[PDB]
Amino acid sequence: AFEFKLPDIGEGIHEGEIVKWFVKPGDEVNEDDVLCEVQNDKAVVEIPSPVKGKVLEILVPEGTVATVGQTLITLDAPGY
């Protein structure tokens, strides 16, 4: 599967404050999609879609905050 956070669990932005999402899940995704709206320190980031596949499930969508070690959303890219 694919994750949302790498082996960080302790650096710079070891968490994720998600403001807005664009999926319902993103069921069938492309290799472009959206940039999730995550906020950090004083700035906000955009995470488009490096790869395509499905948008299986989201656990802690928006409104709440997630860490690393924990997942957020996952992606399937069966052959990358």
Side-chain angles (χ1 to χ4, degrees):
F2 205 173
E3 35 54 54
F4 188 64
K5 302 288 208 172
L6 299 173
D8 177 283
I9 56 175
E11 285 203 59
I13 303 297
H14 41 57
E15 40 194 67
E17 192 195 301
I18 309 125
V19 195
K20 179 197 155 295
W21 258 107
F22 304 54
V23 312
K24 290 86 202 55
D27 171 73
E28 298 233 306
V29 55
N30 56 35
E31 213 132 19
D32 53 90
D33 204 61
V34 127
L35 21 288
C36 311
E37 261 174 287
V38 185
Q39 177 159 266
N40 49 290
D41 36 81
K42 305 180 66 55
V44 191
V45 191
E46 52 177 300
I47 302 68
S49 50
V51 29
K52 86 318 225 146
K54 198 74 187 178
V55 182
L56 304 176
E57 49 189 66
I58 310 89
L59 297 81
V60 187
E62 31 53 63
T64 323
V65 184
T67 183
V68 175
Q70 198 182 315
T71 332
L72 168 61
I73 179 177
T74 172
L75 225 158
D76 87 86
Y80 196 159

